[PDB]
Structure 1
Amino acid sequence: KAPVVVPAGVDVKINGQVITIKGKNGELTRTLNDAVEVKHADNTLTFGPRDGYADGWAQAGTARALLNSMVIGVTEGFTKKLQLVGVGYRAAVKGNVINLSLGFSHPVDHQLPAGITAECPTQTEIVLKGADKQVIGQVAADLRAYRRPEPYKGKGVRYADEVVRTK
């Protein structure tokens, strides 16, 4: 059993195998069904199976993590700061598709997963904030993915790449 205290600005309710967390940023519903009973105490969320088998603890580590992740994502949320760079031809990054990359004719794009905001001001910094984590971390990773020289041209010579400043 690994008791997990909940912040003063966090309210979680559990009904069966469904656990919903409420707060300011928003709400997140997740399901945890295994050989364990997850109950919520007036001041702490408890998680403790009956057996102590390896597979029983492995699921206990991820569970506590997922829960802790749902808490921060409602109090602070998820947001990644990215910046574009280019020595020569300025890469015009739009909310739709980036253009003039390294001087290439056709633009490079990537479908925006889930529903997160990626407002990019006319400057060098951009922001990709959202509710889900596996989403805000993917869209930010893919944004750099395409910025990666496809041809057999090593780095160093091609600085043009929009890397993420902070995680």
Structure 2
Amino acid sequence: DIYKDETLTIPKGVTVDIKARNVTVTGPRGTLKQNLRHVDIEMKKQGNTIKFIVWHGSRKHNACIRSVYSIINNMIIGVTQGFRYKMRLVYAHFPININLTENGTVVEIRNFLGERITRVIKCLPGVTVSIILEGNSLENVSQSAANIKQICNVRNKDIRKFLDGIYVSERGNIE
């Protein structure tokens, strides 16, 4: 295919600028800047329409175009309604104490299966955790959830027997 195009509808965000291959998507929730210099994909902006055009791109380039479109759609959704993920703590004998600091930017986990060493995890920028974490970046929420799960991990313990830990219960849109 010499020319391939992908069309998307811009949301009601204030700014949909994609100048210098940087997507400065500013919506009612906030303004988020994203870099797409990794893949050389032509972009056409016309009103509320954003078109991703690949000129004789390879299969890997074609695959990245769909990935870029999903990334753009996810960024638009986050800038419009946001992303919220809820996780439920699981304990068997020793409850795990969770402390929030800096408006939820820092999470401290104590007494995790009796552990006396507190684990401190720093939340990603633009994401606030109160456990329900809400933010305008779905990727930031997902990475923070993975870090929290990694912190609350049992080492040299029976997974089938010891079910204590932290797992994400659900994840959706704030609005």
Matched-pair contact (CA < 8 Å) for 1:14–1:39: no
Amino acid at match of 2:145: A
Aligned to 1:64: 69
Counterparts of 2:28 and 2:53 in 1: how far apart (Å)? 29
Aligned to 2:56: 51
Aligned to 1:81: 86
Segments of 5+ residues of structure 1 without an aligned counterpart are 120-125
Change (3 A) 1:20 1:102: same
Aligned with 1:102: secondary structure? helix
Structure number with the higher strand fraction is 2
Aligned to 2:161: 157
Aligned residues: 159
Aligned to 2:104: none
Change (3 A) 1:101 1:49: closer
Change (3 A) 1:36 1:87: closer
RMSD of the TM alignment (CA)? 1.9
Counterparts of 1:16 and 1:101 in 2: how far apart (Å)? 47
Segments of 5+ residues of structure 2 without an aligned counterpart are 101-106
Structure 1 stretches (4+) deviating beyond 6 angstroms? none
Change (3 A) 1:105 1:40: same
Identity %, equivalent residues: 25
Amino acid at match of 1:4: L
Question: Is residue 133 from structure 1 mapped to residue 138 from structure 2 by the alignment?
Answer: yes
Counterparts of 1:100 and 1:65 in 2: how far apart (Å)? 40
- Offset at 1:32? 2.6
